[PDB]
Symmetry: C3
Subunit: 128 residues, 3 copies
């Protein structure tokens, strides 16, 4: 009903952690150093895979401090429950300053967003 | 009641499609458009829809376009009572204009579960 | 009955507003601020809130501002346990500075349902 499975794909990967007991997400960590160019984008390696619980998808959502201080926003971010490859992190840098990331830094958070994933499509002439 | 209602405004629209376990339904451009490099545009879809009770319709980014073309969705909160055309706002963070053709996939629709009837109460102290 | 508890930290603050089938609650600036072209800024709201059990508060964009001002919301993950002032991170992707006056609607709060009590298992194979 709600188990979060992690595959650690190299020794460089870190298991996602909660920052508080009641935090929405799990911190996601870089497994390789990378720079996110100013007004640019990059893709951060994590060397992890996961299966989110039934009735969810995994949202790769931004860390607030990196937003406020470094101009960091996450891109992409919809991890399907069926998805089984390495979860990498798209970052946009909306600042004037390159953003240096080291192996071991928290770069994003994972939120298990509850969804309706079994809707019946009904095509209709008009809406209410 | 977990029915997604779809209204097609043109033979140029495509009914959204979903993998039974994917989080999202594909959203297709109904008309050509280029998103300028370091800029934005609004993609026509010629569809309207009503999401299931208990959700809203989140217009979320396609992962491929994020990585390949620096494309992020903007706006993207579709209320359950919205009956107009769902137009897709796209930011292009890359250095290349992103050319979109009719029938191209440009976003995905996630039926996000929400609390949409919380009572708003004003209190002295959250801490209490 | 589920409850969103709001604290008005000053007389400049506005209780958020929500139609019954709308997804979000409007969030208002409590102070003037300009968001620079191709830049970002932090909007003061002078409110704090506690979202219902099973949710976090997502600070999400207004659609009309996205379209006409290039405004995207940044950060926006407000944990249920957060009791500080909720400031709104705005990215301006347009070539015009965006002017915000106290009392302007700048964002929306959605009470996103989530699994906040999942247990991590580690596997060789997904
Ligand atoms: Cl800067
Ligand atoms: Cl580029
Ligand atoms: Na579901
Ligand atoms: Na906004």
């Amino acid at each position: 009903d709600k188990v979060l499975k992690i595959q650690l794909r190299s020794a460089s990967a870190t298991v996602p952690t909660k920052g508080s007991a009641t935090a929405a997400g799990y911190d996601i960590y870089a497994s390789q150093d990378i720079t996110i160019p100013a007004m640019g984008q990059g893709m951060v390696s994590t060397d992890i895979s996961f299966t989110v619980p039934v009735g969810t998808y995994g949202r790769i959502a931004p860390r607030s401090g990196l937003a406020v201080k470094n101009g960091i926003q996450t891109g992409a971010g919809v991890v399907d429950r069926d998805y089984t490859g390495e979860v990498k992190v798209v970052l946009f840098n909306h600042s004037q300053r390159d953003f240096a990331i080291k192996k071991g830094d928290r770069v994003a958070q994972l939120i298990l967003e509850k969804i309706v994933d079994d809707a019946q499509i009904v095509v209709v002439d008009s809406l209410e």
